[PDB]
Design a binder for these strands. Structure first.
Ligand SMILES: [K+]
Ligand SMILES: [K+]
Ligand SMILES: [K+]
Ligand SMILES: [K+]
Ligand SMILES: [K+]
Ligand SMILES: [K+]
Ligand SMILES: [K+]
Ligand SMILES: [K+]
Ligand SMILES: [K+]
Ligand SMILES: [K+]
Ligand SMILES: [K+]
Ligand SMILES: [K+]
Ligand SMILES: [K+]
Ligand SMILES: [K+]
Ligand SMILES: [K+]
Ligand SMILES: [K+]
Ligand SMILES: [Mg+2]
Ligand SMILES: [Mg+2]
Ligand SMILES: [Mg+2]
Ligand SMILES: [Mg+2]
Ligand SMILES: [Mg+2]
Ligand SMILES: [Mg+2]
Ligand SMILES: [Mg+2]
Ligand SMILES: [Mg+2]
Ligand SMILES: [Mg+2]
Ligand SMILES: [Mg+2]
Ligand SMILES: [Mg+2]
Ligand SMILES: [Mg+2]
Ligand SMILES: [Mg+2]
Ligand SMILES: [Mg+2]
Lengths: 126, 195, 154, 123
RNA sequence: CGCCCGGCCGCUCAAAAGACCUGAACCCGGCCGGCGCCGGCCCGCCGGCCCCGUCUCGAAACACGGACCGAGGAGCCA
RNA sequence: GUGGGCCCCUCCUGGUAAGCAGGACGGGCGAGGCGGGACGAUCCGGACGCCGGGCCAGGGUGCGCCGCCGGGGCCGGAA
RNA sequence: GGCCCCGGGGGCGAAGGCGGCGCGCAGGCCCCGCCGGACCGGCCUCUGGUGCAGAUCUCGGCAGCAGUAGCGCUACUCCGC
RNA sequence: ACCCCCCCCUCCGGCCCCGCCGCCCGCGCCCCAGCCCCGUGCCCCCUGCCCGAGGCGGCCCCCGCCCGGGAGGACCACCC
């Protein structure tokens, strides 16, 4: 139920990178795009514009993809997949895929309790 | 947080304005008294034409939209201070609301304790041969209607304060007689070591 | 359509009309002018509008509505006397008071107008003829109307 | 203020953030200390605990004096949490005595992301 | 079924699904809260910020296209 | 892909001249963020991954508006 | 086209819809609550009518404007509910 | 000095006095000279850090229409 001690997690930017001018028009969605206009101020990166995406923001290779609880994620749908991905571990906790019924989450949960695996959606459907 | 009360007699208009504006932005309440006795360097006639060239600038299509030109000596001083303030922001409007300007010394300020700023007083600032004029005289030439009233009120006030000083003189000869309170002679001698 | 008022610990009387052949903007203002009245008052007030003794003030659809002397203390200067909207609202009010005074024997002396909701419905669609061979629309703007009565609001 | 209630102090003022005409650094505050007119007589108030009262909670915010600024007696200070703009022109307290506030006077980048190469223990 | 003079209440049904599956956006009505983007601080202050696409030596331009929203919409094949 | 360029410094040609037109070595904008020159595609510095600390170029240091004192003098445009 | 260790997930609730956390520099992905009421996929290999803000774009819906602009041929009135 | 500024004259946010009839807040007064500067070249420097009368200065609150005539008038408003 606990992972091994790790380095301190740093996020270099806390908010999301939002598409330029998506706040003016409903038809323009907030998903990121690269500015590519000849007169674009966002492309020229004048002061006071939104920040631009670049690989300098990437995360520390030892902590990238690590959830706040300290574990890395594994996504499973059956009891067979519970055992195969967790023979060797202590780096991963497990997650039940959303489509798994309430009848079979009891079988996965109790079985995974014996193996000594954390499940991250233990108390979804009562 | 007291109020700083400045007697504007003898002071240079622009050198006094710079001080008050910096104090206002530090969260201070300031009053200014005797605005008609402040000083503008230069010949009166040069100063006159300068203030009559400002009054010529108005919005051509409607003068109610235009720059307003105030004629009393207190309001001229207040408009000079606004030039040194970012008055169109919230931080700047809070500073204007902390300022007061008065022609003469009226009863709402008559018992306040006053101060001066000698680094902006004309007898220390201006060379002996430079001409200079009083703000009150400039105002009277551009339209101030109350030059004679301020003088009548100033005269009656000083006579009443001249009688007061005589009784205040005697009070000091009783207040200061108190060298008989030892519990203060224990205060003065410790302050002696550090001074 | 469904009711927009959802309260569940009050004894209320309800009535509605769906798709009413009356102006939407006129009828909204008539319902908002009687909100919070006791049901004795609103019945007199509505008869006075019919007889031009009182006005309906207009807070939302007022460009071109004239200012009149009869609107001195209301918050605005503009109002009208919508006779067809007052005919509709009066009959919807009587059903709600009947519905409440019969489901729980409460008198008209403790009933008040505590809710309303007017909504835009789908109109009749005719045409008009314009110059240079053109045709244009000539439509109606009808409404859905609902009204709730119950005990004094606090 | 039930823990700084009796503490005598030297007055100060928070005039603004550190800035140029183009940019503004909100993580450092500029502060005016009464009776300090020279860069040289800033040594006496150097490195001491200060505080400002946030007049929405009523609680204090604690900080320390770090560097001088200019030639004329201004200083730079860093507070436990960076200040809001509403607090400009307000009064700052420079305590004459010592107060153990633990680590509640130190800035948020130094408390976390301060890089002690350190770890998360998980009990 | 009942009650008032279309409404209410409620009946069939797993469900009104009631003129019909699901039922997004733009836009609107009622109750409740408040008075553009980025950054710092829990939060209304301070600082920065011209309208995109396009042809063009050069566009915020008094150069052109574009009220809004949805779905379709242009280097494939021999 | 491009084969409409333009500007600065020095050096020139036609023209009364021009923010006019045509040529030359080197540099720039084009296709170069940031600070400064109030304000400007090109001038003065400096050419750019995401942060924390330090030092400081160019320009400046009454108040707006971040930052100053001491000392010696003086007090648009042609004939 | 294949695999998914007694043979992948589903009325003990699929796809879609509306809000809310997390993960990724990002394109995007994953989970939870409510709605809905019958189907859906992760990894390897194969294939293409494969990704929109603009084209006086096409078709459909629809706002402000706005209760606004506007409603030749002389003429109707009293009583009968 | 036909120029310029003020009066007269037109509009006028705000304010004051008077009619009918409560709240709160602050605690500080010489004057005049600068080539007499009359013996200077200081004081203050704690607005809570332990301050919290009376007088002297501030602040708040306080006043209906419809209806019908008109010397008034698009509608309103205005005067009765
Ligand atoms: K959007
Ligand atoms: K361009
Ligand atoms: K074009
Ligand atoms: K062209
Ligand atoms: K060109
Ligand atoms: K452009
Ligand atoms: K132009
Ligand atoms: K324009
Ligand atoms: K063009
Ligand atoms: K044109
Ligand atoms: K255009
Ligand atoms: K020529
Ligand atoms: K280049
Ligand atoms: K119209
Ligand atoms: K004149
Ligand atoms: K006259
Ligand atoms: Mg026609
Ligand atoms: Mg025809
Ligand atoms: Mg349906
Ligand atoms: Mg062309
Ligand atoms: Mg064209
Ligand atoms: Mg157009
Ligand atoms: Mg589409
Ligand atoms: Mg040229
Ligand atoms: Mg080009
Ligand atoms: Mg600039
Ligand atoms: Mg300064
Ligand atoms: Mg196909
Ligand atoms: Mg296609
Ligand atoms: Mg589209």
């Amino acid at each position: 139920i606990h992972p091994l001690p790790h380095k301190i997690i740093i996020k270099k930017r806390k908010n999301k990178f939002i598409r330029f001018q998506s706040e003016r028009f409903v038809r323009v969605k907030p998903s990121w795009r690269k500015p590519r206009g000849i007169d674009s101020p966002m492309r020229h990166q004048y002061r006071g514009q939104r920040p631009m995406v670049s690989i300098g923001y990437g995360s520390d290779k030892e902590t990238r993809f690590m959830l706040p609880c300290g574990f890395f994620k594994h996504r499973i749908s059956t009891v067979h997949e519970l055992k195969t991905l967790f023979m060797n571990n202590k780096t991963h906790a497990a997650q039940i895929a959303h489509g798994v019924s309430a009848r079979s989450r009891k079988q996965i949960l109790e079985e995974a309790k014996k193996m000594g695996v954390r499940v991250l959606n233990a108390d979804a459907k009562l | 947080m007291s109020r700083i009360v400045i007697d504007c007699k003898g002071h240079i208009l622009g050198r006094l304005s710079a001080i008050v504006a910096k104090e206002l932005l530090h969260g201070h309440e300031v009053a200014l008294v005797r605005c008609e006795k402040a000083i503008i360097s230069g010949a009166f006639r040069d100063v006159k034409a300068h203030y009559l060239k400002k009054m010529h600038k108005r919005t051509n299509f409607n003068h109610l939209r235009g720059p307003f030109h105030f004629r009393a000596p207190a309001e001229i001083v207040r408009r000079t201070i606004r030039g040194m303030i970012p008055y169109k922001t919230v931080r700047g409007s809070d500073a204007m609301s902390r300022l007061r300007v008065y022609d003469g010394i009226p009863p709402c300020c008559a018992r306040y304790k006053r101060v001066v700023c000698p680094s902006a007083m004309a007898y220390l600032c201006l060379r002996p041969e430079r001409r200079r004029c009083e703000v009150g005289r400039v105002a009277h030439e551009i339209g101030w209607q109350h030059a004679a009233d301020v003088e009548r009120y100033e005269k009656r006030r000083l006579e009443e304060c001249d009688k007061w000083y005589q009784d205040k003189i005697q009070i000091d000869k009783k207040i200061a007689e108190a060298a008989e309170k030892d519990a203060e002679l224990q205060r003065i001698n410790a302050e002696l070591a550090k001074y | 359509v469904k009711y927009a008022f959802k309260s569940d610990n009050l004894l209320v009387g309800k009535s509605r009309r769906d798709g009413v052949k009356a102006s939407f903007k006129n009828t909204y203002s008539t319902c908002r002018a009687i909100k919070g009245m006791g049901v004795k008052r609103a019945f007199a007030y509505l008869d006075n509008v019919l007889n031009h003794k009182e006005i309906v003030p207009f807070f939302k659809f007022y460009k071109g509505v004239g200012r009149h002397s009869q609107a001195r203390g209301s918050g605005t200067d503009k109002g009208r006397w919508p006779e067809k909207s007052v005919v509709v609202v009066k009959d919807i009010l009587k059903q709600a008071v009947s519905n409440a005074k019969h489901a729980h024997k409460k008198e008209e002396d403790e009933l008040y107008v505590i809710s309303y909701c007017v909504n835009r419905a789908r109109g009749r669609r005719r045409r008009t003829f314009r110059a240079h061979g053109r045709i244009s629309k000539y439509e109606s703007q009808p409404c859905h109307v609902e009204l709730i009565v119950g005990p004094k609001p606090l | 203020m039930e823990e700084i209630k009796g503490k005598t102090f030297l007055p100060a003022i928070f005039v603004g953030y550190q800035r140029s005409r183009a940019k503004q650094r909100e993580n450092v505050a500029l502060v005016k200390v009464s009776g300090i007119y020279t860069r040289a007589e800033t040594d006496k108030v150097l490195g001491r605990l200060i505080a400002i009262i946030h007049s929405k909670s009523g609680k204090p915010i604690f900080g320390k004096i770090c560097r001088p600024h200019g030639n004329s007696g201004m200083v730079r200070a860093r507070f436990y949490t960076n200040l809001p703009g509403q607090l400009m022109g307000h009064k700052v307290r420079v305590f004459y005595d010592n107060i153990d506030v633990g680590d509640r006077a130190t800035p948020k980048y130094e408390r976390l992301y301060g890089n002690p190469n350190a770890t998360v223990t998980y009990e």
